[PDB]
Amino acid sequence: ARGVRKHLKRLNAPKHWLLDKMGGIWAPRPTNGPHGLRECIPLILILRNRLHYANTYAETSMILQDKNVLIDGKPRTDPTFPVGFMDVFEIPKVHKTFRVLYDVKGRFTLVPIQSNEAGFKLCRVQKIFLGDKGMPYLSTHDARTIRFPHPDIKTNDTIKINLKTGKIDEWYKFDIGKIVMVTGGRNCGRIGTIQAIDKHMGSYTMIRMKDTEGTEFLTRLCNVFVIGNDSPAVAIPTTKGIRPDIIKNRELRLRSIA
Amino acid sequence: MSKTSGLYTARKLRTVRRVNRWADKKYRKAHLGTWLKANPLEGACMARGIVTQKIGISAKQPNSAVRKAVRVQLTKNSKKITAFVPRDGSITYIDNNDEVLVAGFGRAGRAVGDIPGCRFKVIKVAGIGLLALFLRKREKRA
């Protein structure tokens, strides 16, 4: 081409969006922002496609013009705004507060949370670097920037941020035996404990985890998010990160029409 | 073993097959490219042309007859062909300037039966299907 892409065909949209192949040539293209294109969901795809508060695009706009939706405590008036992992989703007029996590099939789900919990956010430290006049900065998985961080915080740790001041009140270190959740790949969405860290000079570092039923699995270090120290700092869905096999899933499916 | 074996001989096994493939007449006719050049129809199902003459052609040895045919000039490449007219009494719809649609006899460019040097046949005359003209379903102007 001669410049950036502004469209996204429906068959080319990410597969965990669960878009259906009829009823449209086009799909919404997420605007740049706190999250990337592949690992996100356009906000409209929650209000219209999922919760049916709106039923078309045009009337999905008017909900976001009068500012009925807060993301991390701020009203976003943009239908293709990228919302993603750990974002707080609060609709006041219906009194619904959610936290955006993954389910055991790598898709985004909303978990109900209490008013005592929606005032903070977990971020993953992506890098530490020296900015202007040699000052230290840290960057997160949300495209957030913090100057003068405490020297203990190192890369791959997670930090806890109050959602009004935008400052740090807690941090969790990446270690052996920490509770963790996988954010992408093919073990996305399930929760376990770290039991190995194998570094390969020049190449990717692999992590081996083990579920609460003891199933062991592997992935890359760029996909493991710490959610606490042997106890998750937040709430998690009812399945709690245990993935069935196809046979047990089939028997649970047979039981729904039963 | 009259063929090479061995775990590292894939290149030889492929070279032999590539070379000996050309020894088959079917493959050589369909893949070389000289038949496509020499084909009067240029690799098409049918072709239209104008009639230049009406002729009668002797049959071959055990038969005895006079088959009816027409010399045709092709519109698209100006080649000379002869085409057979089947179906009793059909040579009477063919004036000396009659656009004809012409197809093959089958056998993909080989002569059939007892007509020497004939590989094509007329299927339409001056816009009208010749078979339906014989079956008396349509008719020519005048």
Binding site: M22, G24, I25, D245, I246, I247 | -
Partner: protein, 166 residues
């Protein structure tokens, strides 16, 4: 493009390789006599629908009795074959699938079911009655002679309450 370019379609029958074989030529018309079959295509369809369920079983039977693919797909195949009534309950072995014939498929047609319960005197009268919207399946009026009736829905085949024969 247009959206219609993304719609799928498929052929659902296979024609035989030698058309002019006498013994299957008359075996193919005894079938058109015992069932009100319109034309040979409705036989072809049947054989095609057999040739797939025969291909699955022979793939799983080559496998091992404890593999998950057998445990999953053979159970699915048997559970599907028991609801349509193409196979009966007492044969719950994957090896009992291979000895199946077309007639087992033809016996679960609505045209055949209504003949069995004697709603229609013959199979031709049955086809005519089907076209006249005179018969309902579970309170639902069904117009298709070739309809396939599940064993759940065979207790409940009647004349439609709205009808001139009521």
């Amino acid at each position: 493009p247009r959206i219609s370019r993304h719609r799928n379609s498929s052929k659902t029958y296979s024609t035989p390789k030698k058309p002019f074989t006498k013994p299957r030529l008359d075996a193919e018309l005894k079938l058109c006599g015992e069932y009100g079959l319109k034309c040979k295509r409705e036989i072809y369809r049947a054989r095609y629908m057999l040739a797939k369920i025969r291909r699955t079983a022979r793939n799983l039977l080559t496998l091992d009795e404890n593999d998950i693919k057998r445990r999953f797909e053979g159970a699915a195949l048997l559970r599907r074959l028991h609801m349509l009534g193409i196979l009966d309950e007492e044969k719950d072995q994957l090896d009992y699938v291979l000895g199946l014939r077309i007639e087992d498929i033809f016996k679960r047609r609505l045209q055949s079911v209504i003949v069995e319960s004697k709603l229609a005197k013959s199979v031709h009268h049955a086809r005519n009655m089907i076209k006249a919207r005179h018969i309902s399946v579970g309170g639902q009026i069904v117009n298709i002679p070739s309809y396939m009736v599940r064993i759940s829905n065979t207790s409940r085949v009647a004349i439609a309450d709205t009808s001139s024969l009521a």
